[PDB]
Amino acid sequence: ENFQKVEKIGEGTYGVVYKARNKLTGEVVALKKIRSTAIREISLLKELNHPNIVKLLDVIHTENKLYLVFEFLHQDLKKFMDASALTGIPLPLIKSYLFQLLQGLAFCHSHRVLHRDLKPQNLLINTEGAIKLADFGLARAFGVVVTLWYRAPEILLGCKYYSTAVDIWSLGCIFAEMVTRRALFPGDSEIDQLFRIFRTLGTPDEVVWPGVTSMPDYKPSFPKWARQDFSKVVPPLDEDGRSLLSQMLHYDPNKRISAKAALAHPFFQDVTKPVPHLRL
Numbered sequence: 687e688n689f690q691k692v693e694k695i696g697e698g699t700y701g702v703v704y705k706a707r708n709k710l711t712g713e714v715v716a717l718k719k720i721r722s723t724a725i726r727e728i729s730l731l732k733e734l735n736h737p738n739i740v741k742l743l744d745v746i747h748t749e750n751k752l753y754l755v756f757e758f759l760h761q762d763l764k765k766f767m768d769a770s771a772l773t774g775i776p777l778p779l780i781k782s783y784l785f786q787l788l789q790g791l792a793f794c795h796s797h798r799v800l801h802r803d804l805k806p807q808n809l810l811i812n813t814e815g816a817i818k819l820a821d822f823g824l825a826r827a828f829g830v831v832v833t834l835w836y837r838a839p840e841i842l843l844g845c846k847y848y849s850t851a852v853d854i855w856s857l858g859c860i861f862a863e864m865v866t867r868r869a870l871f872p873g874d875s876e877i878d879q880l881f882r883i884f885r886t887l888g889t890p891d892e893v894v895w896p897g898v899t900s901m902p903d904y905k906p907s908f909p910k911w912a913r914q915d916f917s918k919v920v921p922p923l924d925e926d927g928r929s930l931l932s933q934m935l936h937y938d939p940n941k942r943i944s945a946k947a948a949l950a951h952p953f954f955q956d957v958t959k960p961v962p963h964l965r966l
């Protein structure tokens with residue numbers, strides 16, 4: 687009752703998203719209609735505020751249906767990439783976005799909150815050059831065609847107790863996609879996703895990932911592929927970038943770089959904040 691629905695933005699991971707106007711403040715928001723532990727978990731996310739996290743304005747439980755009211759941003763990274771397809775995103779903008787995302791992740795991760803489902807459609811961008819993580823923490827609160835392209839290998843191999851490393855893996859994949867203008871691992875099934883990772887990074891074994899062979903969905907029968915070079919996977923990215931991406935894509939989640947450690951990487955020595963070129 688307190689909103690006017692302006693337009694259907696589309697059908698997100700958990701239900702429909704609407705651009706809406708608050709009838710008692712005039713503020714324009716994103717309203718997600720979600721299709722009691724969940725209420726408590728979600729309610730805690732109202733406190734998780736950071737400039738690179740899309741702000742959860744409010745949570746409204748009524749007719750025992752659930753509405754999440756979020757800060758509105760006019761574009762996402764998926765559409766920005768599609769619109770930059772001919773030309774590519776300039777490196778300093780790639781670098782700025784990656785840095786800001788890592789700040790967001792470092793913040794949530796220092797509170798033990800993970801995203802678990804990062805994807806370009808979840809990264810929202812404004813006119814001032816800011817990029818922000820949307821739907822943060824909703825996977826744990828509500829559980830999760832859905833995209834597998836960004837999933838870490840420990841999730842695909844059936845680990846129940848994965849860690850903040852899963853987000854760094856996703857963000858690596860998005861980094862590589864910004865650079866190349868093609869998804870890194872566009873699997874169309876769980877095994878196709880796994881085998882696309884293995885074809886690129888080599889089939890993992892006990893040498894690179896202690897314990898891998900005891901994971902729930904690991905099979906001794908997986909084909910055995912050798913690793914390729916990152917010079918072939920993300921050209922023409924420079925050696926700092928490739929060094930960072932390689933650390934974000936380590937098979938072992940314990941050796942994978944943390945968001946905080948990544949913010950200190952030399953790739954970011956010369957980071958700036960450009961303003962993107964955006965048509966709304």
Ligand SMILES: Clc1ncnc2[nH]cnc12
Pocket residue numbers: 695698703716740756757758759760761810820821
């Ligand atoms: Cl899907 C979407 N679109 C625009 N703004 C948003 N804020 C949170 N989700 C959003």
